[PDB]
Amino acid sequence: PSPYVEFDRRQWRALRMSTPLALTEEELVGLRGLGEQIDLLEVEEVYLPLARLIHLQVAARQRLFAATAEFLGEPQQNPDRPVPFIIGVAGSVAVGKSTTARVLQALLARWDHHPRVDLVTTDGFLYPNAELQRRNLMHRKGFPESYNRRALMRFVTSVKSGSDYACAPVYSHLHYDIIPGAEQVVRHPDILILEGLNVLQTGPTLMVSDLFDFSLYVDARIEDIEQWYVSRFLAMRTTAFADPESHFHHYAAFSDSQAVVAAREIWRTINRPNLVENILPTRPRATLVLRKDADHSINRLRLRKL
Ligand X SMILES: C[C@H](NC(=O)c1c(F)cccc1F)c1nnc(SCCOc2ccc(F)cc2)n1C
Residue of 34, 45, 65, 137 that binds a copy of itself (CB under 8 A): 65
Give strand ranges (E) for 9-67: none
Annotated binding residue at 98? yes
Selected binder of ligand X within 83, 86, 87, 93 (CB under 6 A): 93
Interacting residue with ligand X among 43, 46, 58, 94 (CB under 6 A): 94
Please tell me whether 158 is known to bind a ligand.
no
Considering CB under 8 A, how many residues would be counted as binding a copy of itself?
Answer: 54
Q: Please tell me the distance from the alpha carbon of residue 90 to that of residue 92, in angstroms, as a whole number.
A: 7
Rounded CA separation 199/88 (Å): 6
Q: Select the binding partner of residue 233 from ligand X, a copy of itself, none (C-beta < 5 to 8 A, by kind).
A: ligand X
Q: In the Cβ-directed half-sphere of 145, how many Cα atoms lie within 13 Å?
A: 9
Task: Report the alpha-carbon distance of residue 226 to residue 224 in Å, rounded.
Answer: 5
Q: How far apart are CA 68 and CA 63, in angstroms?
A: 8
Instruction: Give the HSE-up count for residue 107: Cα atoms under 13 Å, Cβ half-sphere.
Output: 26
Query: Judging by beta carbons within 10 Å of its beta carbon (0-12, 13-18, 19+), is residue 255 exposed, middle or buried?
Result: exposed
From the list 28-36, 114-122, 197-205, 250-258, the region that binds a copy of itself by CB under 8 A is 197-205
Q: How far is the CB of 251 from ligand X (least distance, A)?
A: 7
Q: Is 94 annotated as a binding residue?
A: yes
> Is residue 57 within the footprint of a copy of itself (CB under 8 A)?
yes
When asked if residue 41 is in the footprint of a copy of itself (CB under 8 A), the reply is no
Q: How far apart are CA 156 and CA 123, in angstroms?
A: 14
Residue 142 binds to ligand X (criterion: CB under 6 A): yes
Residues that bind a copy of itself (CB under 8 A): 1-3, 5-7, 11, 15-19, 52-53, 56-57, 60-61, 63-65, 67-73, 75, 77-79, 82-83, 157-158, 160-163, 202-207, 210-211, 281-282, 284-285, 305-306
**Which residue ranges are tagged as binding site for ATP?**
91-98
